[PDB]
């Protein structure tokens, strides 16, 4: 049964749903559920296949948290160290504290009356793939024919 | 090495087939017409059935061309608010051509309404159709019902 | 009945604005109506499986048939003994209820439509 | 209960998307913005979500979920659903526990069967 | 940009959010042994009742 779940928890969705993060990661959450149901059923958890325990142990560390950690896990250092880790690892765009978004997409003029004054009713940090300039409208593949980074006018 | 891209059946079923058994079975399911079990390794949650209809209605600005005429009345009920669909209860009637002629459609609904009051009398008097019936009881019930 | 259950979770949302909590209390409904319908449905798929003519699963445990007969003084004469049959009847005597309570839930799950959501 | 429940909803367009279309522009000017699309790729291991629109069986964006579909687990109470006596229910009747409705319901009362 | 704000959180972001935080091991609530009337409430001075 577990060999199905950890397999199913890896099965990746199509493109249309993989645009934020792997959607089926939540099924490993069903391992602390089943691991516990394995005890009350009288089935030993130390008799799971050796290879299977490479992942079942991963699920617990991923999806099981005891209270006495739940009481002391959001500590100041325990969060910044996780930011500190990423800074050493070099990928911090997903982290909120170190996210510095600047490009503010303009308001699309309704040609009903282009004199219609526009403003901003709300602003929210979405990634590009929502509204990136129509991929045919924008020029040829640019990550290869150019390097692109935003800097401020000194 | 990334498991997600590894499972991806995009470039093909190749990198997912190692054992000669499954590859042998790969040739059976494709032949008899079933789905190849390997293709499901990368699941395709197809766009939900409403999100197809929803995408349609937005494109046509409520799609007035296909909404029944009851919807454009006051207090439309869910029965009318959904689109036009050739439901099964028109099946048996054949006097209706694809071009309803003078009063042809009017006659049908009575035949429909008659069959519904049959679906009532079949119920209160204990002549319902059962999932376990055979043809011997089917005639024994229908004729008993038609009584 | 409309208020028969084994476990009754009550979730108390708390937002600063009425229209916030309402629109939210509307959301979780059409959320729990989804997961609630599916999760209960799997057990209903299990229950009808646990009953039928060559569908056994309630085939009584030798342990369970002992617990019914693990009593010094039973219902009708002295010291008692149940056969495995009526034990396998007592079980089905209860699943019939865990179905009626199950299917009575799926029905009240599918009633609310966007046209007539109450 | 849609007539042709198999096909109308088994279609990639919910029965309502015009797959039978070249990607060509029509006679109108508002469509002249786009033109007739170049031929679809001949050797194309395309993405499961998308397609090359060459026909109904290959929509521009596929809709049918690849995972097979179960029927909806129906809400009928089989526990009190009237059922016909199968040959075994003729044969294995003495091994049945049933409520007095089952033994005496008009829909195949199993007592006159048992007596017979 | 065009006003299409979701009346409901889509099913995708449900799974993606619900998988970023771990299950509390205590809310599992399994107990077939019972309650320990003599010892449980008298446990060590560290984790005592």
């Amino acid at each position: 049964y577990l060999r199905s779940v950890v397999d199913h928890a890896y099965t990746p969705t199509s493109e249309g749903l993989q645009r934020f993060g792997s959607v089926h990661v939540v099924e490993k959450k069903k391992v602390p559920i089943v691991l516990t149901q394995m005890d009350e059923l009288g089935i030993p958890r130390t008799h799971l296949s050796g290879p299977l325990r490479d992942e079942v142990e991963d699920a617990l560390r991923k999806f099981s948290i005891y209270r006495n950690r739940f009481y002391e896990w959001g500590r100041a250092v325990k969060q910044f160290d996780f930011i500190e880790f990423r800074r050493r690892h070099g990928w911090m765009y997903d982290l909120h504290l170190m996210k510095n978004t600047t490009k503010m997409l303009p308001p699309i003029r309704d040609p009903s009356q282009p004199d219609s004054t526009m403003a901003s009713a709300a602003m929210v940090e979405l990634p590009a793939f929502f509204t990136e300039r129509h991929p045919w409208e924008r020029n040829a593949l640019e990550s290869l024919l150019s390097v692109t980074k935003e800097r401020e006018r000194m | 090495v990334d498991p997600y891209v590894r499972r991806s059946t995009e470039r093909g079923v190749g990198h997912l087939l190692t054992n000669s058994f499954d590859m042998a079975r790969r040739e059976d399911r494709v032949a008899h017409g079933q789905q190849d079990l390997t293709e499901r390794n990368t699941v395709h949650y197809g766009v939900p059935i409403q999100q197809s209809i929803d995408e349609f209605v937005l494109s046509h600005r409520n799609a007035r061309g296909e909404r029944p005429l009851d919807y454009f009345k006051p207090f439309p009920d869910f029965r009318a608010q959904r689109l036009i669909r050739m439901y099964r209860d028109i099946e048996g009637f054949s006097l209706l051509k694809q071009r309803p002629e003078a009063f042809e459609w009017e006659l049908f609904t009575r035949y429909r309404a008659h069959h519904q009051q049959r679906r009532e009398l079949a119920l209160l008097h204990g002549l319902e159709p059962v999932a376990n019936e055979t043809a011997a009881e089917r005639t024994a019930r229908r004729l008993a019902l038609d009584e | 009945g409309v208020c028969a259950s084994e476990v009754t979770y009550r979730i108390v949302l708390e937002g600063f604005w009425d229209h916030h909590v309402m629109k939210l209390a509307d959301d979780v409904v059409m959320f729990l109506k989804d997961v609630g319908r599916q999760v209960v449905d799997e057990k209903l798929k299990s229950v009808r499986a646990s009953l039928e003519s060559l569908s056994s699963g309630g085939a009584v445990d030798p342990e369970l048939v002992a617990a019914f007969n693990a009593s010094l003084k039973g219902p009708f004469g002295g010291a008692d003994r149940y056969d495995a049959d009526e034990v396998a009847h007592f079980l089905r005597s209860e699943l019939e209820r865990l179905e009626e309570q199950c299917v009575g839930l799926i029905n009240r799950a599918n009633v609310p439509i966007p046209g007539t959501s109450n | 209960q849609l007539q042709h429940r198999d096909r109308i909803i088994g279609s990639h367009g919910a029965g309502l998307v015009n797959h039978q279309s070249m990607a060509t522009m029509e006679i109108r000017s508002n469509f002249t913005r786009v033109q007739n699309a170049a031929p679809a790729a001949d050797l194309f291991r395309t993405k499961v979500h998308e397609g090359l629109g060459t026909s109904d069986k290959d929509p521009y964006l596929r809709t049918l979920p690849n995972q097979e579909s179960r029927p909806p687990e129906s809400s009928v109470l089989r526990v009190a659903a009237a059922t016909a006596p199968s040959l075994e229910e003729r044969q294995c009747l003495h091994q049945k526990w049933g409520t007095l409705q089952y033994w005496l319901g008009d829909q195949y009362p199993r007592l006159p069967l048992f007596l017979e | 940009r065009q006003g299409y704000l979701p009346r409901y959180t889509p099913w995708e972001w449900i799974a993606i959010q619900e998988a970023d935080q771990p299950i509390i091991h205590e809310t599992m609530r399994t107990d077939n042994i019972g309650a320990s009337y003599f010892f449980s409430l008298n446990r060590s001075w560290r984790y005592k009742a």
Binding site: - | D54, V57, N62, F78, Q81 | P114 | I9, P65 | -
Partner: peptide
């Protein structure tokens, strides 16, 4: 029990009575 229950992503589980959004 997957994350996206079978009720949503399915043709046979489609709720014919569920009216579309731009109608009500």
């Amino acid at each position: 029990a997957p994350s996206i229950p079978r009720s949503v992503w399915d043709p046979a589980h489609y709720n014919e009575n569920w009216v579309d959004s731009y109608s009500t």
